[model samples]
Target: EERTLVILGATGSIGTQTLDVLKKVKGIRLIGISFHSNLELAFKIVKEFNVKNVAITGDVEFEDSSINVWKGSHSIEEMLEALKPDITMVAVSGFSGLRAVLASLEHSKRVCLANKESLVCGGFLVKKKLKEKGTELIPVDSEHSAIFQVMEPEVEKVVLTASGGALRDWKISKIDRARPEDVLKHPVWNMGARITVDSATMVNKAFEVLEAMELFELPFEKIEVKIHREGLVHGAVVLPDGNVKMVVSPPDMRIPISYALFYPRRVALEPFFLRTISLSFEDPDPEKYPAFFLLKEIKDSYALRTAFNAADEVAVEAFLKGRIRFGGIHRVIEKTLEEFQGYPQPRTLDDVERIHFEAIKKAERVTEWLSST
Candidate 1:
């Protein structure tokens, strides 16, 4: 029997690459596909792969094809329940991925989760669901995937690597006035704009810290984030025997995607150029990258991670739209986190959803205030 895979956000970078890996692996059925707004690319994928079952979360209609389109303002839970593929690949990019993660766990399906926001915003809730219904989650992000691969034998602690984003070496004054172009110029990986800017602010690393805490069942104190200019060493793990094992490879999304697609089995892939030079690691400057300090506090503080993610998403979007300046992004997040009050514990998905909305709304007000002044 062949394995059936459902891909959410099939039109995005990770989702498209996941499809490429699926094509290489035989006896795997691409059963379902979905996207938020890129229907043109969605149509191209369906036409090429002959995928009949497709869904568009956006408001667009395809008239020419016989593809079974699941439309309307349905929730992510409805979409997942309707398809119920053997393994669900969730590459959807924000807090929106929360629903898909819940649906996957509720149905006991293996989930390949790429959305860091879902974990950061609602880690406890997801864990509770997994405890209720035994389910497995495979991470698709390079840093987490690296830790997952390296910690296979025996592990003590894990270190997640950061390429330090586009503004890694920029002076504080320059960063304060950075434009979208400055933030978008990533040194290593090509990713979505939102993530690129987050990388610049080092908030992406903060989100990853929360993600590692949630996924690996480790406390935040045990996990470490180090600045590695080279993207080769994705993550590191220390064993009880005092040996450190790290996943080192060329920076490529296909490697991790392959691992998720054919998990528990390794397949041969085309070799890429591997640098033999020694990689450098450094402690991030706390003053320059205050996001790390905030994240550390979030680790110890209650409901801080939830508020941080919510505010950062809204602030980043505002920055991208030229509504606020680069440095103002983090300011808005800090203000919202300081003012917003919510339940310290999120017991349900609905609780997380409500907190996320409230935080975003508060952040928006702060952004409006900043813009006016």
Candidate 2:
């Protein structure tokens, strides 16, 4: 059988890597993709993969008669419903990825989820939809995929590794107003702007902890984050007898993407020598990365998680544009979470969307207030 696939956010870092991985795999067809604004790259993907259907989430117009095109905000969802591919990779970033995840569950048999915000903000609603549809949701992010591979029924604790970001070496006093150039320069992984900043703040790691709780059905108490600067050991799980199991590979997103796309079967790729590698782990400095400790207050609440995510997004953008201090990013998120009046747990997708909008609105105001102060 020829399995079909659609990748949302087709022009992103993960999406493009997915296309690269697909070039090496067989029996799966790249039939559809959704992109926001990169028409040049989108068309290139179409040409390389012979993709027939494309959904443009932005206002970009495509007049080609040969390939089907969908335009506007809901186009991704509409395209998912129409194509109903066997696999849907929701590689889109941010909270919008949650909506795409819901839409993918309606059609896709398996969803390769790279957007951790979807799981972080709307865990309940997303999991509910997944259960109702009986769809498979695979984590494409390296850490989650690592945990997924070694997960077991008797696993007592899951330890997630973090690559302490560009500021890992900066003095605590100096990180307050670190330049965007310094913060954007990730030590290991090449990622987008928002994520790069989040890494420096360790907020990205915080989101991963929340995401791990949802993905593996673990409690906040059961998940731990360790600082591993090498980026080789992705994640681990501990047993009752005190044995720790982990997934170690060369730092590559394609490894996990390929694993999800071709489960229970390994494919040949460039292999590395293990004898030449060095690995070490340590505790994340709470005094340095104060934004990460916000998770202690965030525990399983959907509303707070949404606020945390929204505030970080706003604050990161502000810092990138020189509107806020690097330290102000943490302040914005903390203030937003503190001021966030609790909403009843999101019972539906509409409720989730409402909470996201409210959180973003508050976070934006919080960003403005922090900048002025």
Residue-wise C-alpha lDDT for candidate 1, range 263-329, written one tens digit per residue: 8887689765665688888988886787667876677443677789889988899999998889888
CA deviation > 4 Å runs, candidate 2? 276-278
- For each candidate, the alpha-carbon lDDT, in order, equals 0.81, 0.88
lDDT score for residue 18 of model 1: 89
lDDT for residue 189 in candidate 1, whole number 0-100: 90
Model 2 agreement with the true structure over 1-373: per-residue lDDT tens digits? 8889999999999999999898887878999999988989999999888999999988877878899999988898899889989999999988889888889989999998999878888888788898889989898889999999999877888999999989998899999979898887759898789889888999989999998889989978888899998888999998989798978888888999998888767878988666776778899998899999888888768888888888888889999999998999998888888876566777777877787788788889988888888
Candidate 2, residue 45: the lDDT equals 95
